Design a protein around this ligand. Structure first.
Ligand code: HEM
Ligand SMILES: CC1(C)[C@@H]2CC[C@@]1(C)C(=O)C2
Ligand SMILES: [K+]
Length: 407
């Protein structure tokens, strides 16, 4: 086929497995299931796909974890497939390796870390309760538009001190960086995102505020003042993490819960299991997959990797590996050792994961106590979409208002 880059001389023929991360063949069975074909019998630990310009894929948690730990061989400098995307990608601190990475990571951790989440608690609680109550007596909703998008996005826009009317523009930009529809390259989307931030960063360096953008723009890295460019590159990433992560994960969880009455009942009768259920859903419905670039020629697990070779290291795949979790496709809220790399692994561990867990846990509690019984709209065929971050196209839900409660 014409979508397959010619196999490089140095890549073994028997290791070819043409997986397409933006449109995987088994997509209709579910996106996690679609990626899981990389872990079927007779598929190697490390394969090469000729799709998307050609790149390596580590298919098992063992290799995914090791590579993320080895930044000297596997650089974050070019972290996105395809190559053109990875080269344009200059977000901070993600496009940097240690030692230079760390000083910027401490600054970002200040604006979205645990202490910030704690002071955001009550507004997060209120917004969820507000959205769910307004939806409740209607007996139906389009969950992606009606909750999964505005709940975490409005929360981030509050944190960042940005107007909610900007959401449609910014959301479109982030989605082109993760699941491009074709209208925009990563380079064009990033430049437009930077174009948005530039005058906001300048004005908030003259009149500082208490919002995340003011804090980054006026911050210091290892004792020296952060530049305008640096702040722009850091803020841009924060918008991506805030607009296209939790949004997608909530839909996966709620799609599951609508199709599994036994599981809803388990959390209704025992609400104190909601944190544990959150982690299991985080495992079973993992959704992010980026990677690294080789700094030099390097033999990795019997395979010869050449300098400049890209390797996808799918965070999603680790927890779905039966070698980390028995019956990985089954959801067990009582699962004893929930193993995953959903928030990443190595020096680039997710800084927003504490914000993410709170948003997930609150949604679960506040939805189940108000709308305990619900399901998918009759006849609805749920479509998923695949990319750097995967998601749900639409999730139509129905319920009987009489079965609901007000808290
Ligand atoms: C379900 C929720 C989320 C998931 C599964 C997730 C996933 C990930 C992954 C896999 C990475 C590492 C990427 C790599 O190693 O190249 C990462 C890093 C990062 N995330 Fe999250 N993310 C989530 C939510 C959020 C939120 C809400 C924010 C809010 C700002 C955020 C901000 C960041 C930042 C700034 C980094 C960069 C860390 C670094 O490069 O050192 N994320 N995330
Ligand atoms: C891969 C990510 C999920 C992580 C946070 C947002 C994201 C798209 C970034 O590029 C780093
Ligand atoms: K780059």
């Amino acid at each position: 086929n014409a979508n397959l880059a010619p196999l490089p001389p140095h890549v073994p023929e028997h290791l070819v497995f043409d997986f397409d991360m933006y449109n995987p063949s088994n997509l209709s069975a579910g996106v996690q299931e679609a990626w899981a074909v990389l872990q079927e019998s007779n598929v190697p630990d490390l394969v090469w796909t000729r799709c998307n310009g050609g790149h390596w894929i580590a298919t098992r948690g063992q290799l995914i974890r090791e590579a993320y730990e080895d930044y000297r061989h596997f650089s974050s400098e070019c972290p996105f497939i395809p190559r053109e995307a990875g080269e344009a990608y200059d977000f901070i601190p993600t496009s940097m390796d240690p030692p230079e990475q760390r000083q910027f990571r401490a600054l970002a951790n200040q604006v979205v870390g645990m202490p910030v989440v704690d002071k955001l608690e009550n507004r997060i609680q209120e917004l969820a309760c507000s959205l769910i109550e307004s939806l409740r007596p209607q007996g139906q909703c389009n969950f992606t538009e009606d909750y999964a998008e505005p709940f975490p996005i409005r929360i981030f826009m509050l944190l960042a001190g940005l107007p909610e009317e900007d959401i449609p523009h910014l959301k479109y930009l982030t989605d082109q960086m993760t699941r491009p529809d074709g209208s925009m390259t990563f380079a064009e989307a990033k430049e437009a995102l930077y174009d948005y931030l530039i005058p906001i960063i300048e004005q908030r360096r003259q009149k500082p505020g208490t919002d995340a953008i003011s804090i980054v723009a006026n911050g210091q890295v290892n004792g020296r003042p952060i530049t305008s460019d640096e702040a722009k590159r850091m803020c841009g990433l924060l918008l991506v993490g805030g607009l296209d992560t939790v949004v997608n994960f909530l839909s996966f969880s709620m799609e599951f819960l609508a199709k599994s009455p036994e599981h809803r009942q388990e959390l209704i009768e025992r609400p104190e299991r909601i944190p544990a259920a959150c982690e299991e859903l985080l495992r079973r419905f993992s959704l992010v997959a980026d990677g690294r670039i080789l700094t030099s020629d390097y033999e990795f697990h019997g395979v010869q990797l050449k300098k400049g070779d890209q390797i996808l290291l799918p965070q999603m795949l680790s927890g779905l590996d039966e070698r980390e979790n028995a019956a990985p496709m089954h959801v067990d809220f009582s699962r004893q050792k929930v193993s995953h790399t959903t928030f990443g692994h190595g020096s680039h561990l997710c800084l927003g994961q504490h914000l993410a867990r709170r948003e997930i846990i609150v949604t679960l509690k506040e939805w189940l106590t108000r709308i305990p019984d619900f399901s998918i709209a009759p006849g609805a065929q749920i479509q998923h979409k695949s990319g750097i971050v995967s998601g749900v196209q639409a999730l139509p839900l129905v319920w009987d208002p009489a079965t609901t409660k007000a808290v």
